[PDB]
Design a protein around this ligand. Structure first.
Ligand SMILES: O=C(O)[C@@H]1CCCC[C@H]1C(=O)N1CCc2ccccc2[C@H]1CN1C(=O)c2ccccc2C1=O
Length: 285
């Protein structure tokens, strides 16, 4: 009964929606809105709990970068406040290692963070770990073999095709091989032991392309495109299949949800969101 949770986003202003997709029966649930609307946030899950991390309230009465961490219980349909981050991080990436949420990069104003902090749920505290080699907002994050990979983004001056790896136990970052395309606000996730960098923004155009990093060959490889060039897309994995949700395609805020089958090497559209929206965060539980 694991759902695809889609939290926050942007249409006209930052959104509050929390809604869930059942790929099995194709339904959408409407769930308890966020307390404070936010876009450019990230989602993860730890221990059957869903966390919305960072982002931004872009509203009519002004506009404010999030240091927030809020936690949702599906068992209670309730959001609870959580210890805020040391800094606010809009356009943030997040991953999980040992039930520990890594808050990676993001922006405050146009202060572009290279810094990373680890949240620990039991104790409810953030601590700073070793900073990335590169400031990164619009960054995708992928956990793989208990290594944390930060992929692209936008360093403050140029868009990024570069990726780097964190070694949690050594507390160190190391540059891995750069992507075929430059990607800010791509969808980054992991599937069958490869890192997928889906869509994003390359400077000139919004992207439909997708390439997957083989961690042992050290090689990025294109795979089938999406049908809808997109960025600021939500991404996740659900039963051997990648789900890209929504996004910004240059002109509109997409409601489309496309689905990658790695075996057939194809995407198909499987549902629509209830309303078009960019820059959500999504997490499965
Ligand atoms: O967070 C912000 O600064 C933006 C405020 C205006 C629209 C929403 C925010 C944004 O720029 N987003 C969504 C969050 C996000 C996350 C990762 C990578 C990129 C983004 C961007 C995508 N994006 C635009 O660049 C943009 C430019 C103009 C209109 C709408 C959008 C839009 O959704």
């Amino acid at each position: 009964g694991r759902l695809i949770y889609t939290a926050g986003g942007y249409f006209r202003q930052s959104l509050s929606y929390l809604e869930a997709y059942n790929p099995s029966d194709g339904t959408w649930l409407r769930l308890a809105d966020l307390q404070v609307p936010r876009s450019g946030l990230a989602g993860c899950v730890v221990g059957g709990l869903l966390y919305a991390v960072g982002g931004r309230n872009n509203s009519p009465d002004g506009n404010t970068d999030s240091s927030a961490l809020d936690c949702y219980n599906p068992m209670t349909n309730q959001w609870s406040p959580c210890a805020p981050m040391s800094v606010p991080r809009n356009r943030i990436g997040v991953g999980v290692i040992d039930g520990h949420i890594y808050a990676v990069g993001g922006s405050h104003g146009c202060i572009h963070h290279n810094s990373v902090e680890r949240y620990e749920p039991e104790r409810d505290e953030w601590h700073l770990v070793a900073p990335m080699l590169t400031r990164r907002i619009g960054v995708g994050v992928a956990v793989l073999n208990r290594l944390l990979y930060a992929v692209g983004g936008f360093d403050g001056t140029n868009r990024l095709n570069s990726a780097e790896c964190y070694y949690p136990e050594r507390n160190e970052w190391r540059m891995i091989t750069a992507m075929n395309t430059i990607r800010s606000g791509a969808g980054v996730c992991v599937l069958h032991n490869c890192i997928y960098a889906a869509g994003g923004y390359d400077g000139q155009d919004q992207l439909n392309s997708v390439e997957r990093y083989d961690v042992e060959t050290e090689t990025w490889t294109f795979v089938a495109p999406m049908k809808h060039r997109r960025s600021a897309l939500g991404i996740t994995v659900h039963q051997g299949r990648i789900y890209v949700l929504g996004g910004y395609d240059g002109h509109t805020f997409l409601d489309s949800v496309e689905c990658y089958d790695p075996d057939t090497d194809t995407w198909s559209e499987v549902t629509r969101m209830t309303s078009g929206r960019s820059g959500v965060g999504v997490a499965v539980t």
